[PDB]
Amino acid sequence: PESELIRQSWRVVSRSPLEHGTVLFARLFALEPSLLPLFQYNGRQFSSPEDSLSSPEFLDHIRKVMLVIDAAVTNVEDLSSLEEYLTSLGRKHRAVGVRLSSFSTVGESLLYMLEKSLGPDFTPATRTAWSRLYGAVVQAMSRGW
Ligand code: HEM
Ligand SMILES: [Xe]
Ligand SMILES: [Xe]
Ligand SMILES: [Xe]
Ligand SMILES: [Xe]
Numbered sequence: 505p506e507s508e509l510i511r512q513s514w515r516v517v518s519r520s521p522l523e524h525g526t527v528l529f530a531r532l533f534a535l536e537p538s539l540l541p542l543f544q545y546n547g548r549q550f551s552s553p554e555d556s557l558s559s560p561e562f563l564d565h566i567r568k569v570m571l572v573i574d575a576a577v578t579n580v581e582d583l584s585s586l587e588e589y590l591t592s593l594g595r596k597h598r599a600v601g602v603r604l605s606s607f608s609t610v611g612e613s614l615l616y617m618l619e620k621s622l623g624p625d626f627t628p629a630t631r632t633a634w635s636r637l638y639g640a641v642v643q644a645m646s647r648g649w
Contacts, residue, residue, distance in 0.1 A: 505629075506580075506629075506633040506636070507580045507581050507633075509629055509630050509633045510577055510580050510630075510633050510634065510637055511577060511580065513618060513622055513626070513630050513633075513634070514573075514574070514577045516621060516622070517570075517617075517618070517621055518574055518577075521566075521567060521570035521574070522563065522566060522567055522570070524570065524617055524621060525566035525567070525569055525570045525617075526557065526563075526566065527616075527620060527621070528566075528569075528613050528614055528616075528617040529556065529562075529566055530553065530557070531613040531616050531617065532609065532610060532613040533553035534553065535609055535612070535613065536606070536609045537553070539606065539609075540552075540553060540556065542600065542601055542602065543556060543562055543565065545559060545561040545562070550562075572589075572593070573614075575589070576637060577637075580637060583640055583641070583644070586644075587644045590641060590644035590645050590647075590648075591644050591645065591647040593644075593645055593648065594644065594645030594646060594647055594648020594649060595648035595649075596648070597645060597648065597649075598648055598649045604649055607642045607645075607646075611635070611639075611642070614634070614638060615631065615634060615635065615638075618630070618631075618634060619631070
């Protein structure tokens, strides 16, 4: 039942992944501005959250995130088939200054974006399913630490 909730809710999001991931990252930086400095291109720091929105490379980073979530949605019944990628993804993260405790804020910004996108269709069952999927994803990436 849960996998079908995940695939049905994702369907709307995946049609316009940059618009939706823009919402996730805007929210992430409103909640935790101290993450902003981790996204550096040409050795420069964004001053404000809206600076990140004007950067091709940052907008490219978002498309890559939404592609990886999409991979997790396509493989929701068996993530074992994705676990090796995520563990390496995790490693890339720990190496670039990312803290494990930052994962909860990222998950809440994902849930926020899904809830804002889905509206009445974001039933507690959908919230719970996504929170379980995100938790499995974070488990795998935590190995890389
Ligand atoms: C724990 C909170 C997280 C923080 C603070 C964080 C931060 C970062 C940073 C700073 C980068 C490097 C960006 C660049 O140089 O272009 C990155 C890359 C990336 N992140 Fe996250 N991240 C988090 C969690 C996640 C999660 C849960 C996912 C979903 C699986 C994800 C997906 C990705 C992908 C696909 C890349 C690109 C990896 C590559 O280019 O090889 N991140 N992340
Ligand atoms: Xe943003
Ligand atoms: Xe990717
Ligand atoms: Xe995410
Ligand atoms: Xe996820």
